[PDB]
Design an enzyme around this catalytic site. Sequence first.
Site, mmCIF file in Angstrom:
data_model
loop_
_atom_site.group_PDB
_atom_site.id
_atom_site.type_symbol
_atom_site.label_atom_id
_atom_site.label_comp_id
_atom_site.label_asym_id
_atom_site.label_seq_id
_atom_site.Cartn_x
_atom_site.Cartn_y
_atom_site.Cartn_z
ATOM 1 N N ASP A 1 0.775 -1.245 0.000
ATOM 2 C CA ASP A 1 0.000 0.000 0.000
ATOM 3 C C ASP A 1 0.797 1.279 0.000
ATOM 4 O O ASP A 1 1.420 1.628 0.985
ATOM 5 C CB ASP A 1 -0.888 -0.071 1.300
ATOM 6 C CG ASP A 1 -1.884 1.044 1.372
ATOM 7 O OD1 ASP A 1 -2.101 1.910 0.448
ATOM 8 O OD2 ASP A 1 -2.493 1.144 2.484
ATOM 9 N N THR A 2 0.706 1.980 -1.072
ATOM 10 C CA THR A 2 1.361 3.266 -1.288
ATOM 11 C C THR A 2 0.702 4.388 -0.506
ATOM 12 O O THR A 2 1.301 5.487 -0.367
ATOM 13 C CB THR A 2 1.536 3.613 -2.825
ATOM 14 O OG1 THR A 2 0.241 3.958 -3.331
ATOM 15 C CG2 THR A 2 2.232 2.550 -3.628
ATOM 16 N N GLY A 3 -0.512 4.190 0.007
ATOM 17 C CA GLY A 3 -1.212 5.190 0.766
ATOM 18 C C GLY A 3 -1.020 4.932 2.271
ATOM 19 O O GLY A 3 -1.654 5.642 3.062
HETATM 20 C C1 LIG Z 1 -3.749 1.978 7.365
HETATM 21 C C2 LIG Z 1 -2.340 2.093 6.853
HETATM 22 C C3 LIG Z 1 -1.808 3.521 7.159
HETATM 23 C C4 LIG Z 1 -1.440 3.491 8.653
HETATM 24 C C5 LIG Z 1 -2.654 4.726 6.873
HETATM 25 N N1 LIG Z 1 -3.209 4.898 5.549
HETATM 26 C C6 LIG Z 1 -4.518 4.955 5.269
HETATM 27 O O1 LIG Z 1 -5.390 4.739 6.126
HETATM 28 C C7 LIG Z 1 -4.907 5.213 3.819
HETATM 29 C C8 LIG Z 1 -5.420 6.613 3.572
HETATM 30 C C9 LIG Z 1 -6.801 6.918 4.235
HETATM 31 C C10 LIG Z 1 -4.359 7.681 4.001
HETATM 32 C C11 LIG Z 1 -5.874 4.107 3.354
HETATM 33 O O2 LIG Z 1 -6.592 4.423 2.251
HETATM 34 C C12 LIG Z 1 -5.341 2.651 3.211
HETATM 35 O O3 LIG Z 1 -4.753 2.632 1.928
HETATM 36 C C13 LIG Z 1 -6.423 1.659 3.585
HETATM 37 C C14 LIG Z 1 -5.907 0.224 3.658
HETATM 38 C C15 LIG Z 1 -6.985 -0.802 4.125
HETATM 39 C C16 LIG Z 1 -7.173 -0.714 5.689
HETATM 40 C C17 LIG Z 1 -8.345 -1.684 6.005
HETATM 41 C C18 LIG Z 1 -7.915 -3.116 5.736
HETATM 42 C C19 LIG Z 1 -7.585 -3.298 4.252
HETATM 43 C C20 LIG Z 1 -6.609 -2.219 3.720
HETATM 44 N N2 LIG Z 1 -7.594 1.671 2.756
HETATM 45 C C21 LIG Z 1 -8.801 2.177 3.077
HETATM 46 O O4 LIG Z 1 -9.041 2.609 4.189
HETATM 47 C C22 LIG Z 1 -9.863 1.896 2.014
HETATM 48 C C23 LIG Z 1 -10.940 2.937 2.074
HETATM 49 C C24 LIG Z 1 -11.954 2.553 1.024
HETATM 50 C C25 LIG Z 1 -12.290 2.988 -0.199
HETATM 51 N N3 LIG Z 1 -13.383 2.173 -0.634
HETATM 52 C C26 LIG Z 1 -13.592 1.240 0.304
HETATM 53 N N4 LIG Z 1 -12.784 1.463 1.336
HETATM 54 N N5 LIG Z 1 -10.266 0.525 2.168
HETATM 55 C C27 LIG Z 1 -10.296 -0.402 1.223
HETATM 56 O O5 LIG Z 1 -10.152 -0.162 0.032
HETATM 57 C C28 LIG Z 1 -10.684 -1.822 1.548
HETATM 58 O O6 LIG Z 1 -11.218 -1.928 2.826
HETATM 59 C C29 LIG Z 1 -11.475 -3.093 3.463
HETATM 60 C C30 LIG Z 1 -11.381 -4.265 2.787
HETATM 61 C C31 LIG Z 1 -11.619 -5.496 3.432
HETATM 62 C C32 LIG Z 1 -11.957 -5.543 4.747
HETATM 63 C C33 LIG Z 1 -12.135 -4.365 5.482
HETATM 64 C C34 LIG Z 1 -12.483 -4.413 6.852
HETATM 65 C C35 LIG Z 1 -12.600 -3.233 7.522
HETATM 66 C C36 LIG Z 1 -12.370 -2.000 6.883
HETATM 67 C C37 LIG Z 1 -12.003 -1.931 5.581
HETATM 68 C C38 LIG Z 1 -11.882 -3.100 4.817
HETATM 69 C C39 LIG Z 1 -1.789 6.021 7.031
HETATM 70 O O7 LIG Z 1 -0.794 6.197 6.343
HETATM 71 N N6 LIG Z 1 -2.179 6.973 7.835
HETATM 72 C C40 LIG Z 1 -1.554 8.190 8.195
HETATM 73 C C41 LIG Z 1 -2.231 9.363 7.579
HETATM 74 C C42 LIG Z 1 -1.890 9.638 6.255
HETATM 75 C C43 LIG Z 1 -2.447 10.712 5.573
HETATM 76 C C44 LIG Z 1 -3.378 11.480 6.271
HETATM 77 C C45 LIG Z 1 -3.706 11.169 7.591
HETATM 78 N N7 LIG Z 1 -3.136 10.128 8.236
#
Ligand SMILES: CC[C@H](C)[C@H](NC(=O)[C@H](C(C)C)[C@@H](O)[C@H](O)[C@H](CC1CCCCC1)NC(=O)[C@H](Cc1c[nH]c[nH+]1)NC(=O)COc1cccc2ccccc12)C(=O)NCc1ccccn1
Lengths: 99, 99
Positions: free
Chosen positions: B25-27
């Site tokens: 994950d790049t995000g």
């Molecule tokens: C979670 C890893 C990381 C720690 C974190 N990054 C993120 O949360 C990202 C951005 C919001 C910044 C985020 O999109 C990330 O790529 C996460 C990764 C995901 C976590 C849940 C489990 C599967 C994988 N993706 C997402 O949150 C997207 C949102 C979306 C769009 N359509 C549907 N959902 N989720 C998904 O595509 C798929 O989700 C799920 C799939 C399967 C099961 C799930 C069960 C519970 C919840 C989610 C499930 C971060 O860098 N945060 C710091 C930060 C950065 C920028 C701004 C603020 N804070």
Amino acid sequence: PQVTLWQRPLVTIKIGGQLKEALLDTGADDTVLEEMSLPGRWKPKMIGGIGGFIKVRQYDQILIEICGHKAIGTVLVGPTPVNIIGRNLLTQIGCTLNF
Amino acid sequence: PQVTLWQRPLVTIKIGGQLKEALLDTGADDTVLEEMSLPGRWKPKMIGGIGGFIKVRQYDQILIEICGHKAIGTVLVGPTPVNIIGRNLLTQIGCTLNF
Ligand SMILES: CC[C@H](C)[C@H](NC(=O)[C@H](C(C)C)[C@@H](O)[C@H](O)[C@H](CC1CCCCC1)NC(=O)[C@H](Cc1c[nH]c[nH+]1)NC(=O)COc1cccc2ccccc12)C(=O)NCc1ccccn1
């Protein structure tokens, strides 16, 4: 382009005639942007992230330009910490991961 | 390898001779692994994203292998449904986004 990950992969997007910054996120199935008024019809929907489920508005067939490449697809508008470009639009612009 | 984004970028990682699936994950600024009992002292941390924040445990200097490429770094252990490889480890293996 070739985008390295030493920093957050943020690009400029054009949507609704507005320029915004968005993250290219391969861990995201869909494209989620922060609150904005987009033209047309929307439908309420729930999505999940690492913190849980949120509610968003779903807009279909929206034109978006990413680093000048055109994409026409679904955009979810809601309370995301950042504008994120998920896989639905990454594939349209022929984005790949490589190493 | 050239990973397309038609499907969720899931690959095999190896962590202490344990094979596991992880999303590239790049995000993701950080790497988040499913709950697991690692030897060591950790530091508590709270990570955020769509939906809010969750509490995780931070372990430092964990060696992981992403598709036979070594990466050593900081990992967060929490109740994720999937292992997530973030930018911290993606740079150590040469990962870039291309379009
Ligand atoms: C979670 C890893 C990381 C720690 C974190 N990054 C993120 O949360 C990202 C951005 C919001 C910044 C985020 O999109 C990330 O790529 C996460 C990764 C995901 C976590 C849940 C489990 C599967 C994988 N993706 C997402 O949150 C997207 C949102 C979306 C769009 N359509 C549907 N959902 N989720 C998904 O595509 C798929 O989700 C799920 C799939 C399967 C099961 C799930 C069960 C519970 C919840 C989610 C499930 C971060 O860098 N945060 C710091 C930060 C950065 C920028 C701004 C603020 N804070």
